[PDB]
Each structure stands twice: as structure tokens, then as C-alpha cells.
Write a protein that binds this DNA or RNA. Structure first.
Lengths: 79, 99, 207, 63, 60
RNA sequence: UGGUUUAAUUCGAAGCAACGCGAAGAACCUUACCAGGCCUUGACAUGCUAGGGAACCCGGGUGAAAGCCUGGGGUGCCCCGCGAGGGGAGCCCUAGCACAGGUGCUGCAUGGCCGUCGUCAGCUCGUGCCGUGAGGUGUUGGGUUAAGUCCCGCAACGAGCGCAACCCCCGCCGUUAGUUGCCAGCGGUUCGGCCGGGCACUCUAACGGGACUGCCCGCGAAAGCGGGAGGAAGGAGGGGACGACGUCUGGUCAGCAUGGCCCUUACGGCCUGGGCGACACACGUGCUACAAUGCCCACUACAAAGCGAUGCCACCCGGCAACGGGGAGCUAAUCGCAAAAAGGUGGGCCCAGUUCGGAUUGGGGUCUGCAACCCGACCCCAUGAAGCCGGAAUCGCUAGUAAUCGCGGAUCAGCCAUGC
RNA sequence: AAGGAGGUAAAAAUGGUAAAAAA
């Protein structure tokens, strides 16, 4: 992916800074499952946008520098 | 010291030009470097038969453009004069370059 | 049941392009585009009196609006006026330097495009196919070819089953190279569908 | 120069067989039944479209 | 669809990686020879019609 | 591709002739499938009414963009006036409106394109004869050929589209041409055809010549036949493009057209993501392999073709590499891709799942592009699996053909290219 | 070895597929 820098929405930065400016209520409703789970996202509920619903994931650490929607399966039925 | 390049579409009027032009230069001047045959520029195209999904069975096609060269030694008034305007290549353009 | 384009077959020395100018790799595309739009605009809004050749000579800005038409008079204008607006429509849509041409062939039944054009015209106005078309083949053979194959496909009077109709007379060797065959295709369009009109006129050897 | 090494070798056979047939046209009349005059008739045929190696046809199925 | 597709290529979008070829004399994006700006069948028809310049019925 | 599954898994082609097939460049583009947000006199076009603002540059809010409310400046030109005044068009808008739109269905509505039998060797006309006539005839009869190609017979003698043939690619020679070439001729040489000069030789590209069983020996009632000669080229010299009359109610309105049919603030548009990459099998076509004609490391040479100006990039430097920084030259037979590989010369490996094989996978970088999770490619360390030559049965191949090995291109930011 | 004809021995695992119709 990226090499000199790292991709994440700028709106994710700017909206981290706000819900950090209050330590406010839960839910981040990203309408783009792209944007890396870059360090400063702590571990809050991510209702990432699938195409169907809003997959809500409680982030940990074992996932930091690796994409958000990289955690939503979307493709139903496995084997 | 005059280096003229022939850029054309068909060898026919291409050499037909080259004949009179070189002679008219030999006419109103002196020695003229004969119409050298620069390797004819040809392009490659490969389409198929019909629109409907067939991959194999086809028809190939190719672009035909022709390149040549003419030089002289003296910038005579009369050569310049004639070999300037006196032209009708219709569908052929050329390049004047110096050396 | 094919027939590789007899005109695309003629490409040797038996049919010169309908566009001879210099195109240098780059500008060549836009040249082809602009020019094709000229052609296309002509073909309809210049129809009136039927043309074959859509030839154009160009180079640097210079344009040659060259046409082979089956009539010049009632397509040049009552005072050389039809040439005016049209030529300047070209010039307006192709801002450079336009130069009209209305060369005329003294024979209609010679030259397949327009022959087929009339052939399609008759059926377009709902005429009995086989009769009139076969006798049109006979018209062309009252003019003087060595062969004329004017086939006509599509819906024949409707009846769903759109076949193809056999009309011809005299030998036609479109396989042969030095045969010099003008071939012309006319689009037949009935209010009940689309029919095809192919004319094949064979001229002569030693040319 | 040009083409290929071994091909150059064969081309050397031809160049020789053409070099001596020049300065002694008597070797000529006796050299023909050996073939040292013929050039070639075996050049790489064009990649035929529809097949892999210019004649090598791709595999059949049907079933 | 089809009409808006031409406008999409006509207007030319924001980012570079959004453009796509278009046979202007038929209207198609895939396999459009970006030398003539024409598709495969567009190209074929225009050549056979005794219209395509430079090129010839290749028989090498 | 089949399936199954999936919110959705865009559609089509179905023995042979569908299965690396349209598709020769699916990250969102493409895009026609799902969901949601939105738009709707519409993404486009042609036009009437009421009124307005000229056009038009620009800003915020706002969100995923699509989109939505709203905000500053603004006032060219035309009919009469050194003042005021009204209206016209370029123009964008709001309401009715004529209207557009569909990658919605029908190839059993179609042109066109094409696939096919299949390079099949056929198809057929004039005139004469045969029969009451349909019609037979030729063309039914025998050798031979790639051939309805050629000879013989014969109620027929021909002729046409095909066959061939002329057009081209390709080997020998001819005329012209000289920033590719060239000491072949000579002068010099940091000894490079680099510095002068020639066009013979390479060559490059247009007009040509050359081969016809033409000739020599024999055979055959002829066609034809064996052998031989001159020849670069022997009896069809090699490959192409050429594909009849016509069968298939073949396929495709989802490239394109066009009959009908249906919908019409939605079966139309945008945007955004997800998806067409799913996995329990099956199958088609393909790649590299399982290896000592072998693989690994070192060293030196012969390609044709195509591509290349916001492209090709030489070059130097940077990094283990990926690739990046500085930086010459070219719209090119004159600058570059470019490193051909096979060969060959030198050493290893020493019959082991082996230094054979690169599949799985993690660990980190770069490059692409807004952005690479599902979804790119490239590189560096490591894991180094399966696999020790493949039964029922089947692919192709008659001469520069099998196989082996490399190269360029189309589309392309990139690349899923083992494709063409 | 020619035809033409007269009496003797040969050779198909299976196949269902409709229909108002179009000239």
C-alpha cells in the first residue's frame, strides 16, 4: 500500500480530534471501509460502512497499522 | 548543406515528387543528392472478424507511410525560388532541416 | 456466406482512399475525427442529389471539400447559394480554409453506391422488390458493365422471415484483383424493420 | 553479421561457394551436383494467427 | 445505460485514474484502439468502407 | 466455464464450431449486479409560455461524494438620447409544457458483421440433342491432380462465378539512391568507420528480370511419366490476403443500427462503497515442475519485429534490492527500450525430496495511483509444501514443420499477461 | 476382365424429438 506516509481519511483525523476534545460518546460511523486503523484510533467502536449494513468493530491493538474495513467480512458464506 | 526529408502516405506521388523536384534543383542549381529511400514507416493493426465473441478467425491491417531524403550543395537564388513554392504534394508534407 | 469488402479488396491500385492528406502520427487521430464528422454531416445534410466520393485533400490547414455527386445544379443553389451555407458550415465547424467540389459522373447506372441508393429508394417507398430491382439490374446492363449483382436482404414485404433476394446479370469476378468493381451498399428501412441493399457493379480489366 | 551464429556458418558456406565460383567458372560446372550454389529455402515462417507456433494448433475439446 | 457513459468520458472527471477510451463512432470503452480513437469493429468497418487512411488490408 | 452460495455474485456464447471465448489491462474507473445517500425539463438534444438575472469569477455551511440551503463582487453588446427611461440576443434559472431516456424483453422481426460445413469442389448459363412433358444433357464414362487440374471416350460445343491467375510477404540477379554501411581504395587514428572520401559490398525501397516440362535421354493412344541439364530457384518453389450457389429458422437490439413491447420524478442519471475475485466439488484450456542433455555461479558473441516527445529515457549517483535523485540525446535506419536466451569457456552439485521444485506463509521496503482491506505489482530475510514423469482416454505435428529459447507490441497509472 | 441381368452366403448397442405456421 502506502510507502512514504500512510493513508487514512483526513476527516478521520479531524474527527478524532473532536471526540477526543470531550472523550465523548461511542460510535464512529465511517462511510468508507478504507482508511487504515492508524495508531491514534485507540480502540473505539467502528461502525464501518459495508455496502449492506454498518459493521461495528471494537478495535484492539493487534491491528494498528492495518486497514479498517480489513475487519469486515462482507462476503457471506465461507468454507 | 540542405537537408530535406519526405514524409508521405503513398510511394506513388512520393517518388513522382522526388523526380521533378531533384531535377528542377539540378536544373536551377547544381548537384543534388538523389531521393534516398528512408525505411518506409509502417504500423501494425490486428482486429477480428465480427463483433460477436470469436477471439480466433480475424483480419489484420497495417498503416502505410513513406519516408525519403533529398539534399543539395548550393543555396542558389533560382533553386530556392523554384523548389520553394513550385509544389503540389497534395497529401504529403516535408521537413526542411540544416546541417 | 461472407465476401471480404471488395473495396477493401481493391486496396492495391484499384481504389484510392476517400481521404488523401498528410497525417503525422499525433494529429492523425483528431484529423480522422474532424474529417469523419465532416463526412457524416455531409452524407445527410448534403444528400439531396446523391454522392459517391467523399474525398478530402488536406495538409496544413488547407481543406479540399471534394465530392462526386450525381447532380450539381439543384445542389449548388438558385444563385450558387447552396454551396455558400454548406461550405461555410464546414468552415464554421472546421475553422481553417475550405474549398468545395461538385464533380459529376454523367452516368447514374454506373457507380454501385448510387445505383443501390435508388434501388433502396424504390423499396423505401414500398415498391415490389424483385420486379423493379431485377429490371434495375437490367437498367445497369442497359448502361454497359460486364456484370451486376444487386442482392437485397431483409424483411421482404414483412412476413417475419427476412431472407435475401437474388438479383444479378453478367459475370462478376470480385475474386479477381484487376476487375475494378464498384460496390455500393444502401440501407433499406421499412416501418416494419431494416432491410439490406447491396449493389455489385463490375467494370473491366486492363486498367 | 545478422541473424544467427550457426546461420552465419551456413552463410559462410554460401559466401565461399559464391567467392570461388567467381574467379574460376570451371569449378562452377562441377560444383552444382554437390549443391554448393543453392542458397536456402528454409526461413522461419510467420507466426500464423489462430495457432501457437505458426502451425502448432491449440488443444481440442468437444467433450 | 450508455448515454451518460459518453458524458462521463466527455466531461473528463476529477482524478486521473478515472478516464477510459471511447470509440467515438460507435460508443465503447474496452478494446478501443487509442491511435484511431476507435473500437475494433468501428476500425474494421471504417477500413473496409474504403475510408481509413494510411492503413491497408494487411497481407504480409 | 459448470455449479453452489451469495443482500448482490452484471450478461451473453452451449457437440464438433461454447470453456485464456466480447474482454487486448473489473481497485472505485470500467459497470450494465446489491445497499444506501441523492437528482429529476432530467447526463443529452429540438423547442413555446411568465418573469428574472447579463455571461461569469468566487465562499461558507455540509457530508462518503453525489447533493443541498445560503453568501461577496457583478452589469460587454443591439433599437432612440453629453441626463433618466423601456426592451433584443450570447446566457443560467423556476412552473406548466412538446418532450427526452433504458448495457429494460423478444437474433422466432431484422440489416450488418461473422462463425460453419471447408479450400468444401463445388455451383451454373448459352445453343444442339434426348423425353409427351418434369427434366436428363454437358458435368453421366477412365486415369490423374491440391483441384470440375489436365488427357481419352461421349449427343454435344463451349462459356461464367469459384479452381487458378494477376496484389503482396520470401530466397538469385538487374536501374537509381547514400549521416545505415564502408578501408573494399587510400590518409590519419585518445588507433572508435572516430577524423576525409567512395558506393562496389551490407543494407534500406520503388520500377524490374528470372522458370515454361522451355530443353536433353526413355516410357505412356494423351494427360502424364521416370531420370538428367543449365539454373539461386524444378514440375504446386515456400507463406499469405482471396472463402462461391448455399445449409444451419447458428449467434449477437449487451459494440452498432432497426420492427414491435413495456416503463417514464423511474426498468433513467449521479455518487459512494460492496461486488462480478465467493468455495464443499467438477471440467476445459495454459504455466513452471518432478530434474545429472540436468540446476547453480563466473565469462564472451549472432537476432528480425515493434515501440518511443509532458513518451523513450542513455548516463552518473543513492539502496542488499525494489526503486528513487541529479542529469545527455531523439517527433528517430542517426538518441534509447536492449538485458536475447539458447550456444560456447571455466568450477560446483555427486542420485538426496537433493543448492531439484517454487506453492503456503509470516517478517519488512518501494513503486503505482486521490486512495492497493476485500483487490495491484515489484523487491529484501526466512518458512522452503506438494511433486521422484502421470492409467480409462486423448492434443498437435510432413520441413526450418516438432520441440527447445528468447524478443517486441496492442490495451495500459498500475497490473492480476502462464492471455493474445 | 466391361456393362446389364439371373439364382446363392453378408452386413444397423439403442433411440423418443413436436408443430399452426413463413415463399
Amino acid at each position: 500500500s502506502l510507502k512514504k506516509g500512510v493513508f487514512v481519511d483526513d476527516h478521520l483525523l479531524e474527527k478524532v480530534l473532536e471526540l477526543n476534545a470531550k472523550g465523548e460518546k461511542r460510535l464512529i460511523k465511517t462511510w468508507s471501509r478504507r482508511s487504515t486503523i492508524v495508531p491514534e484510533m485507540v480502540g473505539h467502536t467502528i461502525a464501518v460502512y459495508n455496502g449492506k449494513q454498518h459493521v461495528p468493530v471494537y478495535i484492539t491493538e493487534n491491528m494498528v497499522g492495518h486497514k479498517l474495513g480489513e475487519f469486515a467480512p462482507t462476503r457471506t458464506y465461507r468454507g | 548543406k540542405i537537408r530535406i526529408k519526405l514524409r508521405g502516405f503513398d510511394h506513388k506521388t512520393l517518388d513522382a515528387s522526388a523526380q521533378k523536384i531533384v531535377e528542377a534543383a539540378r536544373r536551377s542549381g547544381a548537384q543534388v543528392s538523389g531521393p534516398i529511400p528512408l525505411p518506409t514507416r509502417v504500423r501494425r493493426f490486428t482486429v477480428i472478424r465480427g463483433p460477436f465473441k470469436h477471439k480466433d478467425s480475424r483480419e489484420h491491417f497495417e498503416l502505410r507511410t513513406h519516408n525519403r531524403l533529398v539534399d543539395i550543395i548550393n543555396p542558389n537564388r533560382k533553386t530556392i525560388e523554384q523548389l520553394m513554392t513550385l509544389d503540389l504534394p497534395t497529401g504529403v508534407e516535408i521537413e526542411i532541416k540544416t546541417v | 456466406g461472407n465476401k471480404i469488402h471488395p473495396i477493401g479488396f481493391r486496396l492495391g491500385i484499384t481504389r484510392d482512399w476517400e481521404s488523401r492528406w498528410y497525417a503525422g502520427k499525433k494529429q492523425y487521430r483528431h484529423l480522422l475525427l474532424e474529417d469523419q464528422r465532416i463526412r457524416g454531416l455531409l452524407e445527410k445534410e448534403l444528400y439531396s442529389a446523391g454522392l459517391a466520393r467523399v474525398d478530402i485533400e488536406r495538409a496544413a490547414d488547407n481543406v479540399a471539400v471534394t465530392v462526386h455527386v450525381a447532380k450539381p445544379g439543384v445542389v449548388i443553389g438558385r444563385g450558387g447559394e447552396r454551396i455558400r451555407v454548406l461550405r461555410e458550415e464546414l468552415a464554421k465547424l472546421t475553422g481553417k480554409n475550405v474549398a468545395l467540389n461538385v464533380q459529376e459522373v454523367q452516368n447514374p447506372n454506373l457507380s454501385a453506391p448510387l445505383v443501390a441508393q435508388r434501388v433502396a429508394e424504390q423499396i423505401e417507398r414500398r415498391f415490389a422488390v424483385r420486379r423493379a430491382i431485377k429490371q434495375a439490374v437490367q437498367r445497369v446492363m442497359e448502361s454497359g458493365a460486364k456484370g451486376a449483382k444487386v442482392i437485397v436482404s431483409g424483411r421482404i414485404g414483412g412476413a417475419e422471415q427476412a431472407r435475401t433476394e437474388w438479383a444479378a446479370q453478367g459475370r462478376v469476378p470480385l475474386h479477381t484483383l484487376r476487375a475494378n468493381i464498384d460496390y455500393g451498399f444502401a440501407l433499406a428501412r421499412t416501418t416494419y424493420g431494416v432491410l439490406g441493399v447491396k449493389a455489385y457493379i463490375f467494370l473491366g480489366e486492363v486498367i | 553479421r545478422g541473424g544467427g551464429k550457426s546461420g552465419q556458418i551456413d552463410a559462410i558456406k554460401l559466401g565461399i561457394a559464391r567467392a570461388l565460383v567467381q574467379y574460376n567458372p570451371d569449378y562452377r560446372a562441377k560444383l552444382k551436383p554437390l549443391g554448393f550454389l543453392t542458397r536456402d529455402a528454409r526461413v522461419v515462417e510467420r507466426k500464423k494467427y489462430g495457432k501457437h507456433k505458426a502451425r502448432r494448433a491449440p488443444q481440442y475439446s468437444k467433450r | 445505460a450508455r448515454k451518460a457513459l459518453i458524458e462521463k468520458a466527455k466531461r473528463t472527471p476529477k482524478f486521473k485514474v478515472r478516464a477510459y477510451t471511447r470509440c467515438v463512432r460507435c460508443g465503447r470503452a474496452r478494446s478501443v484502439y487509442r491511435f484511431f480513437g476507435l473500437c475494433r469493429i468501428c476500425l474494421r468497418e471504417l477500413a473496409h468502407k474504403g475510408q481509413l487512411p494510411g492503413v491497408r488490408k494487411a497481407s504480409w
